[PDB]
């Protein structure tokens, strides 16, 4: 079996990373946990033993095979190259490394073939991507693809730890204490990175991330360029509105796309249903589809509410759901460290493409 | 002046029908409350004089000019008959009379000019339908409109009083009980009409109103059938996708269009905050945008994150939210009241076109 390190241990992000590896089928030999020099020494579980954080270095990946990163982007940068250099495979959390044309970014479900070319670094792609890219590749595979126009309802929980507990603060001080929407103080959302910070509480934020400077968000141009990039169609047209809702866990997208041809929605709705790692939840007639709070827990993209367009005689409306936790971030990673095993391609890489700083 | 009457004053669709008529143009002389039997005795204020409430029947409308209905459906479908019969001018917020050729659907700074034909009746659009309207039409008036996509963000306070008493219970369960929102009941959300009811507390439900057999809701059948009616153009092609979430009051809205000609965003900008109805919020380099809490209490309609399409040469985003008890129904109504008076169109109708 493997030696992996999960770096960026301690955060909550971490947890999930820890929780999807104690649930794998990867054979593991010995974990190891890696993170800041402030909780080094600390001590967190590993299924039944107990494992003591080392601090993320730049020799800290010595006998590693594996390794699962999910701190941030400055993180990442720093330590990926040299433990690419220390002959790891790394499978990474962050934007960071997912433009860069020596990066595989891998749904497994989707592009696995895309792992095998891998220069050490595979790329985790953005949450509300990953389940949009379960739901419409086998649409794709039979109909083809020409355009896609997604809205978002998006979870606090993708922003961290911080914006959940704001959330939910914000939520008590106007139920608890008879505070106005309008009266509260934000911190965090809708960017923590941003100048300006608002409520969340009864608000619908149609800013998730930075502005870029052609009025999309960097999370609006991330869905359109991972699309671009996952599904290896550069003439695939994509464009997102991504709008933060108060719900705690899972994301949902009101998604519209046109397809290359006519797709009986029969068969669209059994060509999901065959799709593996998603999930046919539609049947209107009892009020069946994909809700953001039955999906918390499960590692399935649910789909449902799919329908022909009105007018457009190649265009299907569907409502898409995961837990952009799951899904959307640790058990994409996790899965994308089965799939490398599964295939063959754990390995050092023998030319290094990522410089060192 | 005028006498005035509130039919279904006694709800909270009522509550925001007088706020509004209080801060009126409308010369009022008489103020008159109808409702059921339930109630018809109580008292309720007009600004600050004590109103008694009376029983809705079929001869209470005598010296009435303008009724505002803010009942449910099987009131307006029985009493608006009798009213338009009695001389009155029917002002429904109901969906009851929406697709009738004979009753025009008004949202006043699009489409005034249907008042002119009206028989004794004219119709409230459904709320969602009305912000998006007001957003758009000055953009069709100039570069036309060929399609709209359309996702919405619902506030549950379009599904009545009691949806909004649910979503606080549910909501302070997880918050102060401990209760995971998928152990939560529900009784009314997504629909009183339907058979299964699901929490709406951190939750997003791509269901309001009920399913027709196309699949779509009703509800996405009315953004659909209902802008065909309002823009007068059944060649402009609509699909929605209507969802409610987690906020007490004002919807929100994701509209895609695709226009006629090219139509430069700038311009665009420009010629959505010179009408009226309308401001433009859009400012992202100090991330102004719409938002749902700051257009509470406002008749306004609010835009912005206004942009091109990355692909769609004719293609434009936008982020539409507005009051949904405000210019989504009880302002809306009085507005309508208020046009019907500048046009010289508060008289009886000459003839009877709705069976008693």
Not at 61 to 70: K, M, P, R, Y
Not at 292 to 297: L, T, W
Request: charge should be negative; proline fraction near 4%; glycine fraction near 6%.
């Amino acid at each position: 079996g493997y030696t992996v390190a999960v770096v960026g241990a301690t955060g909550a992000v971490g947890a999930q990373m820890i929780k999807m590896l104690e649930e794998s089928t990867l054979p593991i030999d010995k974990i190891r946990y890696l993170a800041s020099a402030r909780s080094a020494g600390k001590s967190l579980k590993f299924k039944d033993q107990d494992i003591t954080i080392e601090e993320t270095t730049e020799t800290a990946f010595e006998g590693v095979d594996i390794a699962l990163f999910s701190a941030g982007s400055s993180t990442s940068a720093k330590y990926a190259p040299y433990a690419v250099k220390a002959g790891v495979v790394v499978v990474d959390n962050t934007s960071y490394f997912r433009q860069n044309p020596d990066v595989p970014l891998v749904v497994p479900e989707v592009n696995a073939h895309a792992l095998d070319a891998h220069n050490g670094i595979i790329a985790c792609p953005n949450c509300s991507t990953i389940q949009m890219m379960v739901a419409l590749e086998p649409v794709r595979q039979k109909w083809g693809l020409d355009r896609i126009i997604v809205s978002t309802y998006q979870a606090v929980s993708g922003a961290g730890m911080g914006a959940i507990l704001e959330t939910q603060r914000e939520l008590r001080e106007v139920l608890n204490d008879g505070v106005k929407p309008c009266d509260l103080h934000a911190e965090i959302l809708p960017s923590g990175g941003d100048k300006k910070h608002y409520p969340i509480a009864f608000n619908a934020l149609p800013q998730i991330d930075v502005f870029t400077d052609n009025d999309y968000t960097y999370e609006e141009m991330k869905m359109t360029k991972e699309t671009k990039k996952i599904m290896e169609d550069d003439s695939i047209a994509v464009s997102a509105t991504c709008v933060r809702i108060p719900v705690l866990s899972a994301h949902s997208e009101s998604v519209y796309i046109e397809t290359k041809e006519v797709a009986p929605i029969e068969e669209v709705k059994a060509a999901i249903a065959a799709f593996p790692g998603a999930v046919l939840e539609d049947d209107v007639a009892h009020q069946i589809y994909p809700q953001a709070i039955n999906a918390v827990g499960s590692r399935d993209t649910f789909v449902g509410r799919i329908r022909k367009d009105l007018d457009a005689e190649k265009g299907i409306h569907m409502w898409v759901v995961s837990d952009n936790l799951l899904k959307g971030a640790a058990w994409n990673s996790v899965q994308i460290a089965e799939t490398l095993h599964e295939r063959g391609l754990v390995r050092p890489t023998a030319e290094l493409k990522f410089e060192l700083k």
